[PDB]
Amino acid sequence: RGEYVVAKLDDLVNWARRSSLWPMTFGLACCAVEMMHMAAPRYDMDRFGVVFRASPRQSDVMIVAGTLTNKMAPALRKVYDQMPEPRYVVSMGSCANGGGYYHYSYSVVRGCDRIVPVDIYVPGCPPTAEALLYGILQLQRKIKREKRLRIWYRR
Amino acid sequence: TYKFVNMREPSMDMKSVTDRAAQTLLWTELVRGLGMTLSYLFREPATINYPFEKGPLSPRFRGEHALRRYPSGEERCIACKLCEAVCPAQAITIEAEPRADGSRRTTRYDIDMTKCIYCGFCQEACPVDAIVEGPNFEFSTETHEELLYNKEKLLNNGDKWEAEIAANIQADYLYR
Amino acid sequence: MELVQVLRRGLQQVSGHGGLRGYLRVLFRANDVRVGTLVGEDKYGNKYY
Amino acid sequence: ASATRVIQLLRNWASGRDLQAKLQLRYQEISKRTQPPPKLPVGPSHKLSNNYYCT
Amino acid sequence: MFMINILSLIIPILLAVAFLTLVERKVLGYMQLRKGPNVVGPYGLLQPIADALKLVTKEPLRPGTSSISMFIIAPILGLSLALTMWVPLPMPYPLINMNLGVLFMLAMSSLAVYSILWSGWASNSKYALIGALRAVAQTISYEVTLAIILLSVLLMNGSYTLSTLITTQEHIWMIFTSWPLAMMWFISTLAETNRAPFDLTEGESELVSGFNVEYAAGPFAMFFMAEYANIIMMNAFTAILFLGASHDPHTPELYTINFVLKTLALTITFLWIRASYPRFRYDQLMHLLWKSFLPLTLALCMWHISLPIMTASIPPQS
Amino acid sequence: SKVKQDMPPPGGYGPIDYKRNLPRRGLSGYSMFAVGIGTLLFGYW
Amino acid sequence: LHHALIPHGKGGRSSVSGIVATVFGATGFLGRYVVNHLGRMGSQVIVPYRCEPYDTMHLRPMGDLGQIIFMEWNGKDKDSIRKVVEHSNVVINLVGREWETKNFDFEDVFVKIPHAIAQVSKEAGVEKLIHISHLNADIKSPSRYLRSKAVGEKEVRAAFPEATIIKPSDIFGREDRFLNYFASMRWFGGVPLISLGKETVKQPVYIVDVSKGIINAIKDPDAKGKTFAFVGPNRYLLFDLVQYIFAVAYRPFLPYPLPHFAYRWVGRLFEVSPFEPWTTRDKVERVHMSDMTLPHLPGLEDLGIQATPLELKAIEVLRRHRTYRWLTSEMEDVKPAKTVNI
Ligand SMILES: COC1=C(OC)C(=O)C(C/C=C(\C)CC/C=C(\C)CC/C=C(/C)CC/C=C(/C)CC/C=C(\C)CC/C=C(\C)CC/C=C(\C)CC/C=C(\C)CC/C=C(\C)CCC=C(C)C)=C(C)C1=O
Ligand SMILES: NC(=O)C1=CN([C@@H]2O[C@H](COP(=O)(O)OP(=O)(O)OC[C@H]3O[C@@H](n4cnc5c(N)ncnc54)[C@H](OP(=O)(O)O)[C@@H]3O)[C@@H](O)[C@H]2O)C=CC1
Ligand code: SF4
Ligand code: SF4
Ligand code: SF4
């Protein structure tokens, strides 16, 4: 059946996507320190296929770790627009989610959402390195439930 | 009391110069660096198999918030607004009103979990141990709105993590 | 003297995980093969070791 | 998961020191996570007399 | 029976680099107390396939300021050069029995650098041109030592034919007669392939990219697979040239098993040094070769022209 | 009962070293060169 | 107005506009802009989608938290349409497709779907339904796109009487398939203008002008039942319009004359592609067909808006198509092409 063939093919692509996420570190504030602890051998982010890779031309997901200051807000959008785009954005910490501690400041945007679309939200201040691992695991589940080929077959 | 970290003058005798020359040509400190990387290769990796092996925590851990209730069943919050008054990030919003039966509780108790700093000041300020930070730290969500907890979601957390929060404060109340 | 014990210990894991079929089950779904005593069982089916 | 002596000799020699004595992994020397309840002391001002705040 | 032979080389080669990326992280992790990929398949035995399949399905894009033609041909240059270079390697019997196999590999390996800056120049990026200009003078200065080291060692061969190394080190390993040249040969191989005492070509710490600056799923995969293939060979070339093995003419499988083992051990050392040393600054890596490697290079050359003459050990030309 | 808080053991904790423990290993300078030259001489023969 | 629908604020994101839009097919060209304009004013837009949720990600950061709600809907299902429009003030129709899918032809997506949307909206009890149809909508034009659109707007008018109907001429913008379509024709050798494109007359309209036109129609009280026609200020002959595109893009120009029947054949050849087709036979007819002036219908200006000339917003679309030799050229280097009297 055509639907079955597109079903297996979609799963193959989705497996290839979720099993290789290459974060482009936007290390901004104390949320970045905890994320490096995820890369530390205690949790070993690398072991899940997900390994840190620079050059957003060669990265799949953004991990917004820290406050997003209005001065650098154009930089966040520019590095987001340059990713080969099967692409997702992970927001770490209360500050990146909706402003957090500095929600009422004059120079902190109330959440990274106002600049970029945001996938799974990671709450914390900072979210423990284990909590982020759960977040990345959630994105892998979200990638697993992608029906890109099924929608194309039913267009 | 100070110590000179780098004030070592090498000896100029025929022995020492040859060793430095032998170190130079026959790369030794590079081999010592190589030799020790081999030592760590054969060692025991410290990686914990997440999520089958969750990390070690303490009873004082601060995570997802929850409102607890008395053993009778009635909530502990009596709407003194101490938690809202001391919240450093003003993530707490409270609205109270006389209940039908008398003793009155909150009609709105919203915690902005994207504005919360998880400092734990709310659970200290609470004179009835009503608002606490539970042991959960895996409540990541796909949408920003799902983080903005209100009274109903928080009360649900209190009725879900009660079997764990009760033991934690049971082990830590004496320290406080 | 210890390599043979190591292989026997490694071979014992296939008997520990309910035979070879169970061994691949844990390997392909839990990424570990280490056996351990069963401390308890919860109502939802999770096995704690 | 303490390894075979053959590795221990190789691992020790490659690093140049006895690694089995002091290890990076905590096996059992850690304190038990279920400790007996404590009895916190009191401050110097916890007195029933001659403890006026004006002083 | 030649297309089968060629495809019995291309597919194993691309699969060798394929799982070298797995034995990279799984070795790098274990040397930094991590565990490496062990999730995708048992022990990570499927992680590179997951990596590769993603890197041929995620959106590729030419830079807006690119030069399309030179941007596309550079991955062609890198991959074809890497594959074509394995051709005269004398695994028992070489696939192509070149009379001047050594000179061939020198010429094409000197060509694998046109890919790096044609990619850099066409990308029209500030980090691209910097990385391109870093790499070219890096390789050619390291190439002068590469040529002389090969010549000095091969003076005991009597020819440039790769097959004759089997006969030359039949009783005694070549390294025992040219170990001083072996050390600089290994360092130069670390430098031509841009591993990480001199990975400044990538320069991720200071140049973020440079192997593949805006290069994406396809072209990034090539520029990776074109340099990891060079990793395996430059140790296979080191293995064949210095550490010979017994070769029974009736059972070549023993030699292939031995030859593969030496390449595997050498490749691990390439990964081993990669996580045990800092990054050479540009002037340092140029100073190391132009001011310390070359003076020893010429001196040991003159030794190896004279050595067969003084000992009456001129090797047979045939 | 009496006050009970986290306290050091009655005799105090054991010593904790802090100084550099870099060992000295390998042959002296002449020995390394001699074995390096000796290998060349045997290899040459 | 309902107690929770009274407008509040100063028009910002957190301001309560008071309109609950239900923009259909918002995962597209105009759908992106109309949601944005609704997003700025603080309007709870119920955006239904049938595509992958990932393709709707760009829609998320255009409204305050809880404003933009994503719902799953299917074209051939009354229940899905009812679910999305049950609680709404205004329903915006933007479903369309320049080609005929295997499961959806021009008949299905321009008459059947608008019929269900209009009929269900009236049963639900919405106030305004803004339906969009081509300006060149005609019952006898050979291009089934125009033919289907004419049937649909008449049917939608019957089902929903006071349903404002928009008739834009031809939108141009960042992803328009109108300026991009002509600029993309460099690959296929030269540009094969039908009859050199010396007879076709077009009146392109800026996409942003259409978007604000829709929003102004929503707030306008007189839009009930009217049938608007959105056209750009100037009016361009096809050959000169393509001249302006390639001059702004700084690309070589090869005016290939190509017979109409032959063009219909190559449109058939490109139609075979299972994926997004480069062009269809119906597309060839559309660019060959002109945009007739309809002065009787109220224009864009009547919706308190000023049209934007294409020569003012041309570099927006064609800066990308320029190579590095012309990636930094200014805006006024290329002057507007011939302007046939409007
Ligand atoms: C600073 O330092 C740095 C480095 O290092 C010094 C680095 O390393 C790195 C790299 C980073 C890391 C290692 C970190 C982790 C990252 C990764 C692991 C990235 C992984 C990247 C990959 C590219 C994945 C690689 C993995 C795999 C599994 C690749 C697998 C390969 C394939 C799927 C393809 C294999 C080949 C195939 C199938 C060939 C098939 C061929 C055929 C069928 C035959 C073809 C030929 C013919 C038919 C011939 C006949 C035809 C004719 C004659 C036609 C004639 C035509 C005419 C017209 C005449 C970085 C960044 C760096 O910063
Ligand atoms: N010049 C022009 O193009 C003009 C166009 N219009 C009208 O504007 C409308 C939108 O145009 P535009 O945004 O450019 O079109 P696009 O093709 O860019 O977007 C069409 C939208 O409709 C949805 N859609 C189409 N067919 C179906 C279907 N069968 N089932 C479900 N959803 C469907 C699409 O979903 P998905 O993205 O998943 O495919 C998408 O949201 C159309 O009605 C068009 O005729 C009016 C005047 C001028
Ligand atoms: S959320 Fe907390 S930890 Fe994260 S950046 Fe803000 S203040 Fe720092
Ligand atoms: S822990 Fe969070 S909710 Fe409690 S006082 Fe601190 S910031 Fe407020
Ligand atoms: S501090 Fe406790 S009792 Fe007081 S308002 Fe907050 S939750 Fe209620």
mmCIF file of N, CA and C in Angstrom, chain A residues 3-94:
data_model
loop_
_atom_site.group_PDB
_atom_site.id
_atom_site.type_symbol
_atom_site.label_atom_id
_atom_site.label_comp_id
_atom_site.label_asym_id
_atom_site.label_seq_id
_atom_site.Cartn_x
_atom_site.Cartn_y
_atom_site.Cartn_z
ATOM 1 N N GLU A 3 0.118 4.173 1.422
ATOM 2 C CA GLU A 3 0.138 4.769 2.753
ATOM 3 C C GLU A 3 1.133 4.060 3.662
ATOM 4 N N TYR A 4 1.187 2.729 3.593
ATOM 5 C CA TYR A 4 2.149 1.990 4.402
ATOM 6 C C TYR A 4 3.576 2.349 4.015
ATOM 7 N N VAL A 5 3.848 2.457 2.714
ATOM 8 C CA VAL A 5 5.196 2.792 2.265
ATOM 9 C C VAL A 5 5.595 4.172 2.769
ATOM 10 N N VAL A 6 4.680 5.138 2.683
ATOM 11 C CA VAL A 6 4.973 6.472 3.192
ATOM 12 C C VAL A 6 5.063 6.463 4.712
ATOM 13 N N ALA A 7 4.385 5.521 5.371
ATOM 14 C CA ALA A 7 4.446 5.451 6.826
ATOM 15 C C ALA A 7 5.825 5.010 7.298
ATOM 16 N N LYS A 8 6.357 3.938 6.709
ATOM 17 C CA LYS A 8 7.691 3.483 7.078
ATOM 18 C C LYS A 8 8.746 4.515 6.701
ATOM 19 N N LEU A 9 8.606 5.135 5.528
ATOM 20 C CA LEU A 9 9.591 6.117 5.092
ATOM 21 C C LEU A 9 9.627 7.315 6.031
ATOM 22 N N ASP A 10 8.456 7.776 6.477
ATOM 23 C CA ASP A 10 8.407 8.881 7.426
ATOM 24 C C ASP A 10 9.094 8.499 8.731
ATOM 25 N N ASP A 11 8.846 7.283 9.217
ATOM 26 C CA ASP A 11 9.477 6.838 10.451
ATOM 27 C C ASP A 11 10.992 6.799 10.313
ATOM 28 N N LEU A 12 11.489 6.383 9.147
ATOM 29 C CA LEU A 12 12.931 6.353 8.921
ATOM 30 C C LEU A 12 13.525 7.752 9.002
ATOM 31 N N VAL A 13 12.869 8.730 8.376
ATOM 32 C CA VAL A 13 13.354 10.104 8.443
ATOM 33 C C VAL A 13 13.248 10.635 9.863
ATOM 34 N N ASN A 14 12.097 10.429 10.507
ATOM 35 C CA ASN A 14 11.922 10.920 11.867
ATOM 36 C C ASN A 14 12.904 10.270 12.828
ATOM 37 N N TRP A 15 13.198 8.983 12.642
ATOM 38 C CA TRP A 15 14.234 8.350 13.450
ATOM 39 C C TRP A 15 15.590 8.991 13.201
ATOM 40 N N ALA A 16 15.904 9.287 11.942
ATOM 41 C CA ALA A 16 17.176 9.933 11.638
ATOM 42 C C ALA A 16 17.232 11.347 12.194
ATOM 43 N N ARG A 17 16.078 11.994 12.357
ATOM 44 C CA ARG A 17 16.061 13.344 12.905
ATOM 45 C C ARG A 17 16.233 13.322 14.419
ATOM 46 N N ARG A 18 15.366 12.586 15.120
ATOM 47 C CA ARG A 18 15.392 12.610 16.578
ATOM 48 C C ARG A 18 16.664 11.992 17.138
ATOM 49 N N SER A 19 17.289 11.074 16.406
ATOM 50 C CA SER A 19 18.494 10.433 16.909
ATOM 51 C C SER A 19 19.746 11.265 16.682
ATOM 52 N N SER A 20 19.637 12.411 16.011
ATOM 53 C CA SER A 20 20.776 13.308 15.807
ATOM 54 C C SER A 20 20.267 14.745 15.900
ATOM 55 N N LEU A 21 20.307 15.303 17.104
ATOM 56 C CA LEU A 21 20.065 16.721 17.334
ATOM 57 C C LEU A 21 21.400 17.364 17.671
ATOM 58 N N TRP A 22 21.760 18.421 16.951
ATOM 59 C CA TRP A 22 23.036 19.081 17.199
ATOM 60 C C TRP A 22 22.785 20.494 17.696
ATOM 61 N N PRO A 23 22.742 20.714 19.007
ATOM 62 C CA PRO A 23 22.456 22.052 19.527
ATOM 63 C C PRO A 23 23.501 23.062 19.090
ATOM 64 N N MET A 24 23.034 24.269 18.807
ATOM 65 C CA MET A 24 23.898 25.415 18.557
ATOM 66 C C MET A 24 23.855 26.248 19.831
ATOM 67 N N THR A 25 24.890 26.102 20.657
ATOM 68 C CA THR A 25 24.914 26.735 21.970
ATOM 69 C C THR A 25 24.739 28.248 21.896
ATOM 70 N N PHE A 26 23.611 28.738 22.389
ATOM 71 C CA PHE A 26 23.492 30.154 22.719
ATOM 72 C C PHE A 26 23.626 30.349 24.227
ATOM 73 N N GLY A 27 24.828 30.072 24.721
ATOM 74 C CA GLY A 27 25.116 30.254 26.126
ATOM 75 C C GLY A 27 25.111 31.712 26.522
ATOM 76 N N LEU A 28 24.110 32.121 27.297
ATOM 77 C CA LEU A 28 23.949 33.514 27.689
ATOM 78 C C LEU A 28 24.200 33.727 29.176
ATOM 79 N N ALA A 29 23.495 33.005 30.040
ATOM 80 C CA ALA A 29 23.588 33.246 31.471
ATOM 81 C C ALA A 29 23.739 31.939 32.233
ATOM 82 N N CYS A 30 23.528 31.981 33.552
ATOM 83 C CA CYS A 30 23.733 30.810 34.399
ATOM 84 C C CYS A 30 22.974 29.582 33.918
ATOM 85 N N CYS A 31 21.983 29.747 33.046
ATOM 86 C CA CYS A 31 21.358 28.583 32.436
ATOM 87 C C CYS A 31 22.323 27.798 31.559
ATOM 88 N N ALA A 32 23.353 28.445 31.008
ATOM 89 C CA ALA A 32 24.320 27.733 30.180
ATOM 90 C C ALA A 32 25.235 26.839 31.002
ATOM 91 N N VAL A 33 25.577 27.255 32.222
ATOM 92 C CA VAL A 33 26.465 26.459 33.064
ATOM 93 C C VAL A 33 25.844 25.104 33.366
ATOM 94 N N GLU A 34 24.557 25.087 33.718
ATOM 95 C CA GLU A 34 23.890 23.817 33.973
ATOM 96 C C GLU A 34 23.801 22.964 32.716
ATOM 97 N N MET A 35 23.661 23.584 31.546
ATOM 98 C CA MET A 35 23.609 22.798 30.320
ATOM 99 C C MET A 35 24.941 22.113 30.050
ATOM 100 N N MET A 36 26.052 22.793 30.333
ATOM 101 C CA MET A 36 27.352 22.150 30.181
ATOM 102 C C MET A 36 27.501 20.964 31.125
ATOM 103 N N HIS A 37 26.850 21.011 32.290
ATOM 104 C CA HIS A 37 26.855 19.856 33.182
ATOM 105 C C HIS A 37 26.130 18.679 32.550
ATOM 106 N N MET A 38 25.149 18.958 31.693
ATOM 107 C CA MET A 38 24.543 17.894 30.902
ATOM 108 C C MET A 38 25.559 17.296 29.938
ATOM 109 N N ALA A 39 26.418 18.137 29.359
ATOM 110 C CA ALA A 39 27.519 17.640 28.546
ATOM 111 C C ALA A 39 28.605 16.991 29.390
ATOM 112 N N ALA A 40 28.655 17.295 30.683
ATOM 113 C CA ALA A 40 29.624 16.681 31.568
ATOM 114 C C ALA A 40 29.347 15.184 31.673
ATOM 115 N N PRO A 41 30.352 14.377 32.024
ATOM 116 C CA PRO A 41 30.156 12.921 31.970
ATOM 117 C C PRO A 41 29.137 12.397 32.963
ATOM 118 N N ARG A 42 28.642 13.227 33.882
ATOM 119 C CA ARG A 42 27.598 12.765 34.790
ATOM 120 C C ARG A 42 26.335 12.382 34.032
ATOM 121 N N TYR A 43 25.939 13.184 33.040
ATOM 122 C CA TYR A 43 24.759 12.884 32.242
ATOM 123 C C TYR A 43 25.064 12.552 30.789
ATOM 124 N N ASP A 44 26.162 13.060 30.234
ATOM 125 C CA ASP A 44 26.677 12.629 28.935
ATOM 126 C C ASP A 44 25.641 12.810 27.825
ATOM 127 N N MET A 45 25.358 14.079 27.524
ATOM 128 C CA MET A 45 24.430 14.385 26.440
ATOM 129 C C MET A 45 24.846 13.693 25.149
ATOM 130 N N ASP A 46 26.155 13.562 24.923
ATOM 131 C CA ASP A 46 26.659 12.972 23.686
ATOM 132 C C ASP A 46 26.111 11.563 23.473
ATOM 133 N N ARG A 47 25.944 10.795 24.553
ATOM 134 C CA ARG A 47 25.554 9.395 24.431
ATOM 135 C C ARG A 47 24.200 9.212 23.758
ATOM 136 N N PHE A 48 23.355 10.240 23.738
ATOM 137 C CA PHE A 48 22.048 10.157 23.106
ATOM 138 C C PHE A 48 22.086 10.534 21.633
ATOM 139 N N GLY A 49 23.270 10.570 21.029
ATOM 140 C CA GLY A 49 23.404 11.006 19.654
ATOM 141 C C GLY A 49 23.523 12.512 19.553
ATOM 142 N N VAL A 50 22.894 13.211 20.494
ATOM 143 C CA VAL A 50 22.940 14.668 20.528
ATOM 144 C C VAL A 50 24.316 15.122 20.995
ATOM 145 N N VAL A 51 25.036 15.823 20.121
ATOM 146 C CA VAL A 51 26.377 16.317 20.415
ATOM 147 C C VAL A 51 26.443 17.787 20.033
ATOM 148 N N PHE A 52 27.215 18.558 20.793
ATOM 149 C CA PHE A 52 27.304 19.992 20.553
ATOM 150 C C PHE A 52 28.094 20.274 19.283
ATOM 151 N N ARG A 53 27.533 21.115 18.417
ATOM 152 C CA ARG A 53 28.172 21.493 17.164
ATOM 153 C C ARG A 53 27.911 22.966 16.894
ATOM 154 N N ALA A 54 28.975 23.711 16.616
ATOM 155 C CA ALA A 54 28.884 25.135 16.324
ATOM 156 C C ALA A 54 28.469 25.330 14.866
ATOM 157 N N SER A 55 28.637 26.555 14.352
ATOM 158 C CA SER A 55 28.318 26.888 12.967
ATOM 159 C C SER A 55 26.870 26.556 12.635
ATOM 160 N N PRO A 56 25.912 27.401 13.054
ATOM 161 C CA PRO A 56 24.480 27.093 12.895
ATOM 162 C C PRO A 56 24.078 26.547 11.533
ATOM 163 N N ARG A 57 24.921 26.735 10.518
ATOM 164 C CA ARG A 57 24.709 26.056 9.246
ATOM 165 C C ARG A 57 24.800 24.545 9.389
ATOM 166 N N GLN A 58 25.354 24.057 10.497
ATOM 167 C CA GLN A 58 25.555 22.635 10.734
ATOM 168 C C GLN A 58 24.917 22.196 12.048
ATOM 169 N N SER A 59 23.800 22.822 12.417
ATOM 170 C CA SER A 59 23.113 22.546 13.669
ATOM 171 C C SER A 59 21.618 22.424 13.417
ATOM 172 N N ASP A 60 20.941 21.692 14.299
ATOM 173 C CA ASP A 60 19.518 21.413 14.146
ATOM 174 C C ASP A 60 18.631 22.141 15.142
ATOM 175 N N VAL A 61 19.041 22.266 16.401
ATOM 176 C CA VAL A 61 18.189 22.834 17.435
ATOM 177 C C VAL A 61 18.923 23.958 18.149
ATOM 178 N N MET A 62 18.175 24.977 18.553
ATOM 179 C CA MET A 62 18.687 26.035 19.411
ATOM 180 C C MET A 62 18.329 25.728 20.854
ATOM 181 N N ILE A 63 19.275 25.943 21.755
ATOM 182 C CA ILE A 63 19.037 25.793 23.182
ATOM 183 C C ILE A 63 19.271 27.164 23.804
ATOM 184 N N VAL A 64 18.197 27.933 23.959
ATOM 185 C CA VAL A 64 18.292 29.269 24.538
ATOM 186 C C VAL A 64 18.504 29.118 26.039
ATOM 187 N N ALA A 65 19.730 29.356 26.496
ATOM 188 C CA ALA A 65 20.099 29.199 27.901
ATOM 189 C C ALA A 65 20.527 30.556 28.445
ATOM 190 N N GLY A 66 19.602 31.237 29.113
ATOM 191 C CA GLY A 66 19.891 32.488 29.778
ATOM 192 C C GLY A 66 18.911 33.573 29.397
ATOM 193 N N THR A 67 19.127 34.749 29.983
ATOM 194 C CA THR A 67 18.296 35.907 29.689
ATOM 195 C C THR A 67 18.536 36.378 28.263
ATOM 196 N N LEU A 68 17.492 36.897 27.630
ATOM 197 C CA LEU A 68 17.618 37.461 26.294
ATOM 198 C C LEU A 68 17.499 38.976 26.403
ATOM 199 N N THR A 69 18.626 39.670 26.299
ATOM 200 C CA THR A 69 18.662 41.116 26.459
ATOM 201 C C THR A 69 18.301 41.802 25.147
ATOM 202 N N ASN A 70 17.551 42.903 25.251
ATOM 203 C CA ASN A 70 17.052 43.591 24.064
ATOM 204 C C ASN A 70 18.174 43.979 23.110
ATOM 205 N N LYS A 71 19.369 44.261 23.632
ATOM 206 C CA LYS A 71 20.474 44.664 22.768
ATOM 207 C C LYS A 71 20.862 43.553 21.802
ATOM 208 N N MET A 72 20.889 42.310 22.276
ATOM 209 C CA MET A 72 21.310 41.172 21.472
ATOM 210 C C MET A 72 20.162 40.481 20.760
ATOM 211 N N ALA A 73 18.928 40.927 20.974
ATOM 212 C CA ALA A 73 17.774 40.302 20.334
ATOM 213 C C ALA A 73 17.907 40.147 18.823
ATOM 214 N N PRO A 74 18.437 41.114 18.061
ATOM 215 C CA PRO A 74 18.683 40.838 16.636
ATOM 216 C C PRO A 74 19.614 39.662 16.393
ATOM 217 N N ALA A 75 20.602 39.447 17.264
ATOM 218 C CA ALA A 75 21.512 38.320 17.079
ATOM 219 C C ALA A 75 20.782 36.991 17.204
ATOM 220 N N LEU A 76 19.856 36.887 18.158
ATOM 221 C CA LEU A 76 19.100 35.649 18.326
ATOM 222 C C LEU A 76 18.296 35.327 17.075
ATOM 223 N N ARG A 77 17.618 36.328 16.514
ATOM 224 C CA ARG A 77 16.837 36.098 15.304
ATOM 225 C C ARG A 77 17.740 35.731 14.131
ATOM 226 N N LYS A 78 18.875 36.417 13.989
ATOM 227 C CA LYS A 78 19.752 36.146 12.854
ATOM 228 C C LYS A 78 20.323 34.736 12.912
ATOM 229 N N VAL A 79 20.802 34.303 14.081
ATOM 230 C CA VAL A 79 21.325 32.945 14.180
ATOM 231 C C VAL A 79 20.210 31.916 14.114
ATOM 232 N N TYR A 80 18.967 32.313 14.388
ATOM 233 C CA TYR A 80 17.851 31.395 14.196
ATOM 234 C C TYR A 80 17.502 31.259 12.722
ATOM 235 N N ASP A 81 17.596 32.352 11.965
ATOM 236 C CA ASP A 81 17.203 32.323 10.562
ATOM 237 C C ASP A 81 18.219 31.610 9.683
ATOM 238 N N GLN A 82 19.417 31.340 10.193
ATOM 239 C CA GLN A 82 20.484 30.757 9.393
ATOM 240 C C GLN A 82 20.607 29.249 9.559
ATOM 241 N N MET A 83 19.697 28.620 10.283
ATOM 242 C CA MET A 83 19.769 27.179 10.482
ATOM 243 C C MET A 83 19.078 26.449 9.336
ATOM 244 N N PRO A 84 19.747 25.502 8.679
ATOM 245 C CA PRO A 84 19.028 24.559 7.818
ATOM 246 C C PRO A 84 17.882 23.939 8.598
ATOM 247 N N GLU A 85 16.674 24.074 8.061
ATOM 248 C CA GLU A 85 15.479 24.197 8.894
ATOM 249 C C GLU A 85 14.534 22.998 8.807
ATOM 250 N N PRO A 86 15.013 21.806 9.102
ATOM 251 C CA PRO A 86 14.311 21.028 10.126
ATOM 252 C C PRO A 86 14.876 21.498 11.451
ATOM 253 N N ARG A 87 14.161 22.362 12.160
ATOM 254 C CA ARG A 87 14.771 23.113 13.243
ATOM 255 C C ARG A 87 13.780 23.321 14.372
ATOM 256 N N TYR A 88 14.314 23.344 15.587
ATOM 257 C CA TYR A 88 13.518 23.459 16.794
ATOM 258 C C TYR A 88 14.287 24.311 17.790
ATOM 259 N N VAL A 89 13.557 24.932 18.710
ATOM 260 C CA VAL A 89 14.146 25.840 19.685
ATOM 261 C C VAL A 89 13.743 25.372 21.074
ATOM 262 N N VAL A 90 14.729 25.171 21.939
ATOM 263 C CA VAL A 90 14.510 24.774 23.323
ATOM 264 C C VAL A 90 14.857 25.959 24.209
ATOM 265 N N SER A 91 13.920 26.357 25.061
ATOM 266 C CA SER A 91 14.120 27.474 25.972
ATOM 267 C C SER A 91 14.431 26.930 27.360
ATOM 268 N N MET A 92 15.586 27.308 27.897
ATOM 269 C CA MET A 92 16.045 26.842 29.199
ATOM 270 C C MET A 92 15.866 27.959 30.215
ATOM 271 N N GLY A 93 15.241 27.642 31.337
ATOM 272 C CA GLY A 93 15.183 28.567 32.445
ATOM 273 C C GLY A 93 14.007 29.521 32.347
ATOM 274 N N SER A 94 13.633 30.071 33.501
ATOM 275 C CA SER A 94 12.494 30.976 33.553
ATOM 276 C C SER A 94 12.741 32.226 32.722
#
